[PDB]
Amino acid sequence: QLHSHRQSLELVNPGTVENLNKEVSRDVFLSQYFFTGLRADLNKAFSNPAFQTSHTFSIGSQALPKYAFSALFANDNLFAQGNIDNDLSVSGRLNYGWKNISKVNLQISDGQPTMCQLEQDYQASDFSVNVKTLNPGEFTGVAVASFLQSVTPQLALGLETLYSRTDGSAPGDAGVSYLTRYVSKKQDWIFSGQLQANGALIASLWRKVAQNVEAGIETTLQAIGIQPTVEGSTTIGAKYEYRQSVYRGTLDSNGKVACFLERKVLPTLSVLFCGEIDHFKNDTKIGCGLQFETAGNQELLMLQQG
């Protein structure tokens, strides 16, 4: 009676909840590329269904293993991985995306017993749904759902819940959040937003300047009468892509700078460098190292030069 009036002129679909803030936090801010010591990883590929085999060495880095074998395999619809390190710890991932894909992320350690997951997705041209559990009379563990859909051709907003219960005979809690995302008129500044549980909130944007220059701001405010304890941190970045170079670098509040250069001096070899100055304690961290690849098939290496 009222469905077909608006579902013919509209309904572009938004991205998932994971890719809400992807275009700023994991693209122009280097907070996951950084390291401290020296590291030099190398990987042979002989792929079409691909294949890799990566090793990794590291020293004096405080968060890295001193060895890490790997593998993967990915045809038109599958995925796999594997990651064993120096003493013993195994990982693994799967994808079976026939539109509802369905991941599994197992994680075995030794001091901590066993981590497991499960996931789901659905993209039906106007909305997205993420369903995720954790390790489970016995309804135990964490279970997270979500929802996100678009009501105008530029705006979209939804929310997500959770349900955490541990400790056996314990009832368990249930938080809530609210999400939002605005897109510009012609492929430009994308204002995101967030309001999670316990008061914290995120804000960001991403201006696409002329050819290869970006920007981005981020802001968090995380909060017996000593409990109101707020904090803040506003960061500003950029990224200068080129042919055979990539440069990004941020600076923020409470005193820090950072830089990350990657200069590929061969067709198939590249170096990098990353360093940071603190301006309160006046102490610094410097990390450098290389990364290169080769081929193992008898003719694949003939088809990267010319």
Partner: protein, 44 residues
């Protein structure tokens, strides 16, 4: 006084020039790596 009105504004000229040598010099090496290539292939 002299031992306050200089060192409280002498340290400020440090932090604005160990910053502009850290975020500006890796950028300046990356320009020349694309500057000389656009003219080497302009010759041919």
């Amino acid at each position: 006084f002299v031992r306050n009105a200089f060192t409280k504004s002498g340290n400020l000229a440090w932090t604005l020039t160990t910053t502009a040598l850290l975020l500006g010099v890796p950028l300046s090496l990356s320009i020349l790596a694309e500057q000389q290539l656009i003219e080497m292939e302009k010759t041919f």
